[PDB]
Design an enzyme around this catalytic site. Structure first.
Site, short mmCIF file in Angstrom:
data_model
loop_
_atom_site.label_atom_id
_atom_site.label_comp_id
_atom_site.label_asym_id
_atom_site.label_seq_id
_atom_site.Cartn_x
_atom_site.Cartn_y
_atom_site.Cartn_z
N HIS A 60 0.84 -1.22 0.00
CA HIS A 60 0.00 0.00 0.00
C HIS A 60 0.87 1.27 0.00
CE1 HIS A 60 -0.11 -1.40 4.26
NE2 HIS A 60 0.19 -0.12 4.54
N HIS A 115 4.43 11.18 5.75
CA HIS A 115 4.04 10.89 7.09
C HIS A 115 5.21 10.33 7.93
CE1 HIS A 115 -0.36 10.70 5.73
NE2 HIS A 115 0.04 11.96 5.88
ZN LIG Z 1 0.36 7.83 5.98
#
Ligand SMILES: [Zn+2]
EC number: 4.2.1.1
Length: 255
Positions: A60, A115
């Site tokens: 992912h 992130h």
């Molecule tokens: Zn993320």
């Protein structure tokens, strides 16, 4: 779960009911509505001692993993209470330059979003942390197409090696400081993980100032596969989730 037509974000609620919960992420940051909070302290990013181990394609995204057995790469201050340890960093991107980020600013979408995931050391391991409201702290940074980010090239060059799901490669001596914008002004709100389990444990820290990458850099991202080796090729693109309802929550600004 995935980002396809039949397993995409609109379907996650079936397996992860929390999907339609009260503190879901990502969201649209309304800059006219965001509250200037003067009691907000400066961010404290200490990554000089960071120890990168490897990089893997989990199907992912691609994760750069760090040694989190000691307070080596930490985040503190800002809205946070106590010390958060960096465990991994990854990105969300699009098929075009016009989309890819999770969070949006005034409805504006960036090419990608970085992130930096940290977990609250009072809970002892990431696993326990994900079970707390104050469990995680995620540093979000927007990526815009312009000039190349030198600091990001070592990651781009290794992508060939982890093209398919389940592949990983040694990735030592990577310095995350090369990925930070100049200013550390930020927005913060209480949210959740943007992919399943979509657990509502994150304190979001979204920097105002985006970093720029060249078209060539982001292009290499798009050459990744969701699929495993020897499977029909599915390009890893648009691994982002539609913005969620703020539902009462308030977005605070450090500026
Ligand atoms: Zn993320």
């Amino acid at each position: 779960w995935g980002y396809g037509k039949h397993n995409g974000p609109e379907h996650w609620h079936k397996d992860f009911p929390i999907a339609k919960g009260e503190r879901q992420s990502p969201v649209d940051i309304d800059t006219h509505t965001a509250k200037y909070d003067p009691s907000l302290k400066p961010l404290s990013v200490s990554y000089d001692q960071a120890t990168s181990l490897r990089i893997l394609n989990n199907g992912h995204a691609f994760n750069v993993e760090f040694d989190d057995s000691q307070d080596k790469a930490v985040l503190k201050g800002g809205p946070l209470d106590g010390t958060y340890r960096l465990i991994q960093f990854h990105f969300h991107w699009g098929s075009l330059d016009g989309q890819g980020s999770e969070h949006t600013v005034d409805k504006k979408k960036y090419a990608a979003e970085l992130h930096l995931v940290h977990w609250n050391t009072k809970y002892g391991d990431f696993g326990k942390a994900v079970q707390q409201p104050d469990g995680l702290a995620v540093l979000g940074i927007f990526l815009k197409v312009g000039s190349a980010k030198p600091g990001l090239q070592k990651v781009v060059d290794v992508l060939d090696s982890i093209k398919t799901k389940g592949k990983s490669a040694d990735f030592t001596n990577f310095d995350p400081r090369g990925l930070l914008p100049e200013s550390l002004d930020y927005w913060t709100y209480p949210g959740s993980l943007v992919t399943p389990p979509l657990l509502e444990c994150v304190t979001w820290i979204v920097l105002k100032e985006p970093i720029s990458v060249s078209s060539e850099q982001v292009l290499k991202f798009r050459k990744l596969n969701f699929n495993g080796e020897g499977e029909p090729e599915e390009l890893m693109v648009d691994n982002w989730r539609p913005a969620q309802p703020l539902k009462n929550r308030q977005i605070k600004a450090s500026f």
